Amino acid sequence: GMPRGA
Amino acid sequence: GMPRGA
Amino acid sequence: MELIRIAMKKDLENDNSLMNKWATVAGLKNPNPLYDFLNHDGKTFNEFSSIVNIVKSQYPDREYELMKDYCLNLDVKTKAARSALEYADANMFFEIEDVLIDSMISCSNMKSKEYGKVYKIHRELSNSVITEFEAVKRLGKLNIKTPEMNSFSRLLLLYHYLSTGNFSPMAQLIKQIDLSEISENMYIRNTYQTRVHVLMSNIKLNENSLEECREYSKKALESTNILRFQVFSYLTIGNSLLFSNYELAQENFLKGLSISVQNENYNMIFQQALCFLNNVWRKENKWINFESDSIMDLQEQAHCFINFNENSKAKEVLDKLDLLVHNDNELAMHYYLKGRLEQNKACFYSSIEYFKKSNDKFLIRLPLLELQKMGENQKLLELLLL
Amino acid sequence: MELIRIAMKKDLENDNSLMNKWATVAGLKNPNPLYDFLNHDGKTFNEFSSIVNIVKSQYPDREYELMKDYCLNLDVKTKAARSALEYADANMFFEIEDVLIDSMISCSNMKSKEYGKVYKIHRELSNSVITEFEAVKRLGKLNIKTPEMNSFSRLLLLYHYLSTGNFSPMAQLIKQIDLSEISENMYIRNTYQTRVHVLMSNIKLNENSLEECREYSKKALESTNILRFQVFSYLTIGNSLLFSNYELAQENFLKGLSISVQNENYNMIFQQALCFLNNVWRKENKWINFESDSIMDLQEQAHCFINFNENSKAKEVLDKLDLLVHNDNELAMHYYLKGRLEQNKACFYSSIEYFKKSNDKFLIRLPLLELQKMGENQKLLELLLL
């Protein structure tokens, strides 16, 4: 999967 | 159209 | 003396057993609050449902006449008058409502003033006297204290989105409503519960969860004795069956029409419902409204003409429609009709695009069926329903 | 006596021009509050940004060491300590944060107690120590007074939804946040503004509005000097370019890595980013983490094996994955990988269905591209993006 973050 | 309502 | 109180006194003189029957219907522990209500000017029941229920049980055919006279004589500063405002809006008794609102805007009680001002915003928004932006701003500027008006400020936006074909925000906005925080006024809490059920039913219809749509309308019906909510429950249940069961859709629309035909507005709504159903099933259609110039009715004329190969009559109607401004939901239908007339794939693609903008996962079935008939990949079409 | 104060005294003795330079960087009218801070125990700046900015300007490599010592010596009843809590959470300094929280949950100041309790709910929710339901309930029970915690109680849910692949509720929840109601604490207001920008950027990514995604991350960058936010801005901007521009995605991920490589966690995040990018573009992939057993890393191993026709090595990895619990977003990716391995249309349909459940309009591009390459109707595919 693609890392997402905020 | 189709009538909608609440 | 209010007309309701004169009538009840007269009926009581002719039948003594009414005192106890009315007390049961009104949900009372004993007849004391009823004796008090009958004999003292301005004495009100603790819950507004008591008077409503008695009027529905005893004078079903005089409800408007009697409640108009009763509501317009209430002291606007009371809980009964606050209840009356919701009663009037729920039943679309606009003459009662607008008089109550105007009294309440400029009265000395702060609860009644806030109710009045929120309901005024709803009345204006739904009459296109103000925009959503202006409404949201005016609501912000009132620093709303009551959990009731906190609820209703959200409900009024839901109605606006429903009638402008803007379905995307509805699902999450409704979740914000917490009816259990309303503790003073049970009539308002219970009526709002009915409103939420009917709106939920519409939100599920638009998401294409149809069993759930039907469950919510069934819950609305069980929770209520108000014609307006019963009308919209039968409308929504019938709507949910538009593609899957002609007979059962028709049974719901006719049921709805049968209890509401005496009201012009509801009569029209069910004509439009039956009109739509018969076009979808390409049947002879006795429900077309030839006098009307609205997009909704012209679309149905064009749809019927197309079903019966009267193409140049269809083309005339569609030309009239090309000169009207459409919201996204209406334009989605417009492209479907053009697609049917011209047999043109691109029109069905455009139709799909506008149902997607509108977040209508229900009526999108119309152009998707045409693409299926033209041999497009059935699996991709099903995926376009999600 | 705090380490920051010792260090500043020492540096001031070696260079007198620092007094005025520090005063400028700290946003001060004159050096009085600096003189006061250096000489008097427990004197705090009006705005927490003054101390942060001095540390960033003068001791960029000692920030953690110095701010740990400084924050852990504050009176937890103060505005500075409230500021410190946010500073610690924003920078993911969990050791500082959890000590502050514990002090503040049981202190006599009501503002500090509320901050402590809301942040504790955030810490627990993000560690899967409690569920969303339990968190929403505990937050409801607190009867939150401050506009700050009103904001943060919504922010903490946004983070939860982002990390669980549950993108649907994010767009409407973020609209409810009103930062202009925060008047006391500018550090908190401004940091929260950065948070909102980066979250907005992620929401737009998931909606497939990519120019808008990039605009919000650019606004985050301009608004901030905090590494955590800069990291996630470059991550999100690079992500938004995953299908359209290999070189520019890579430039953003490398830029991000270049400012953050010294932090293990950020270093890993950018390796995973570059790992994903290189798989999407089917390049040789030096960024695979072979030691890891997480779904995220295993998926990337399998993806690489598939790109290079090592199908039975791919199949082994996918078997390991079949034994692990997936959320909807992860399972969508899983079906895409199975689809690629087997060249099987049905796997791409399933993939689409799970991206739709997850409300991911970005990564859905993966199975859609495969269907395009198999000659499925391109227009229907585009429509499945909306």
Numbering used by the authors:
A (entry chain D), B (entry chain C): 1 to 6
C (entry chain B), D (entry chain A): 1 to 386
Task: Give excerpts from the publication.
Arbitrium communication is mediated by the production and secretion of a hexapeptide (AimP) during lytic cycle. Once internalized, AimP reduces the expression of the negative regulator of lysogeny, AimX, by binding to the transcription factor, AimR, promoting lysogeny.
The crystals of the AimR-AimP complex diffracted up to 2.3 Å resolution in space group P41212 containing two molecules of AimR in the asymmetric unit arranged as a dimer with one bound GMPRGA peptide per monomer. The peptide is bound in an extended conformation that allows contact with residues from all of the TPR motifs with the exception of TPR1. AimP R2 side chain, which is highly conserved among arbitrium peptides, interacts by hydrogen bonds with N206 (TPR5) and N329 (TPR8) and a salt bridge with D360 (TPR8 and TPR9 loop). The closure movement induced by AimP binding (between 10° and 20° calculated with Dyndom [Hayward and Berendsen, 1998]) reduces the distance between the TPRN-ter and TPRC-ter subdomains, allowing new interactions between residues of both subdomains that stabilize the peptide-bound conformation. Superimposition of the two monomers present in AimR-AimP dimer showed that both subunits are almost identical. Comparison of AimP and DNA-bound structures confirms that the closed conformation induced by AimP reduces the distance between the DNA recognition helices.
